[PDB]
Design a protein around this ligand. Structure first.
Ligand SMILES: *C(#N)N1[C][C]2[C][C][C][C]([N]C3=[C][C]=[C][C]=C3C(F)(F)F)[C]2[C]1
Length: 203
C-alpha cells in the first residue's frame, strides 16, 4: 500500500455531502483511499507532466529516498449550499511534525500550491496526523461543476490528462522527505464508483 513504514496514508477522500444530509446523511466521494506487492512506473515516464523546476519530481527523486515516491492514478466519480470537503489521515510510530506540500501542475506548469504543518496525536500505539473535513478549494469546487457539465466522458479524461498534483510530506524539524505522491486523474463510469491504483515510482 501507500506509505513508507515511517508514514502511511491511512485514508484520504475528497467529497461532497448534499445539503439534505443534515436530515438523512450521505456523502459523495469524488476520490477515496482507505488502508485502515505493488506495481511500478519508471519515474522518467511522468517527468513531463510535472515541473522540471525546484520542487519538480526529478529533483526530489534525486534527493531520495526512492522508496518514498509513489504514483496514484485516480478514477473520479463525478456522478452527483452543499459542503465540499477534503480529509486526509496518516499514521507514524515516530512523533514528528510534518509539512505537506500539495502542488497542482497544469500543463506541466505549477499553478497553485498549499503547504501545511500537522503535529502528531497519539492513539492506540500509533501517532496519527489528522487533516479532516477541511473545506475544499473554491478552485476545485468550480472546476468540478464545469467538468461534470462536460457532455462526454472522454472529454473529461482529456482535460484531466492535463492536470496533475504532486504531494510531498517532509519532516519539518529534519526537513527530510518522508513521502512523495504523484497523482494523475481520469474519470470513472457512473455505475463504477471512485477508484484508484497505487504504483511505486522506480528507476
Ligand atoms: C483545497 N481545499 N484543497 C485542499 C488542498 C490540500 C490537501 C489536498 C489537495 N488535493 C489533493 C491532493 C492530492 C491528491 C488529490 C487531491 C484532490 F483530488 F484535489 F483532492 C488540495 C485541495
Amino acid at each position: 500500500g501507500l506509505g513508507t513504514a515511517r508514514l502511511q496514508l491511512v485514508e484520504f477522500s475528497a467529497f461532497v455531502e448534499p445539503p439534505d444530509a443534515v436530515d438523512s446523511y450521505q456523502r459523495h466521494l469524488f476520490v477515496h483511499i482507505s488502508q485502515h506487492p505493488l506495481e511500478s512506473v519508471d519515474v522518467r515516464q511522468i517527468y513531463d507532466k510535472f515541473p522540471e523546476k525546484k520542487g519538480g519530481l526529478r529533483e526530489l527523486y534525486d534527493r531520495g529516498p526512492p522508496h518514498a515516491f509513489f504514483l496514484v492514478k485516480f478514477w473520479a466519480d463525478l456522478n452527483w449550499g452543499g459542503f465540499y470537503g477534503v480529509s486526509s489521515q496518516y499514521e507514524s510510530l515516530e512523533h514528528m511534525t510534518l509539512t505537506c506540500s500539495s502542488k497542482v501542475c497544469s500543463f506541466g506548469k505549477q499553478v497553485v500550491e498549499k503547504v501545511e504543518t500537522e503535529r502528531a496525536q497519539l492513539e492506540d500505539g500509533r501517532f496519527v496526523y489528522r487533516l479532516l473535513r477541511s473545506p475544499m478549494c473554491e478552485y476545485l469546487v468550480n472546476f468540478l461543476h464545469k467538468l461534470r457539465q462536460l457532455p462526454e466522458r472522454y472529454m473529461m479524461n482529456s482535460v484531466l490528462e492535463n492536470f496533475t498534483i504532486l504531494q510531498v510530506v517532509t519532516n519539518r524539524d529534519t526537513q527530510e522527505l518522508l513521502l512523495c505522491t504523484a497523482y494523475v486523474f481520469e474519470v470513472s463510469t457512473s455505475e463504477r464508483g471512485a477508484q484508484h491504483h497505487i504504483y511505486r515510482l522506480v528507476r
